[PDB]
From Swiss-Prot:
Disulphide linkage map: C2-C15
Organism whose genome encodes this protein: Pseudomonas aeruginosa
Source taxonomy: Bacteria, Pseudomonadati, Pseudomonadota, Gammaproteobacteria, Pseudomonadales
Protein name: Fimbrial protein
Record carries keyword Ligase: no
Keyword annotations from UniProtKB, A to Z: Disulfide bond, Fimbrium
Family label: Belongs to the N-Me-Phe pilin family.
Coiled-coil residue windows: none
Stretch of the intact protein here: 7 to 23 of 23
Transmembrane annotation, as ranges: none
A biological-process GO annotation: cell adhesion
Amino acid sequence: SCATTVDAKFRPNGCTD
C-alpha cells in the first residue's frame, strides 16, 4: 500500500494504493 508509515515525505504524488 502507498499509505503505510505516517509522514508527508513518504507517500508519492499520484501513487496507486
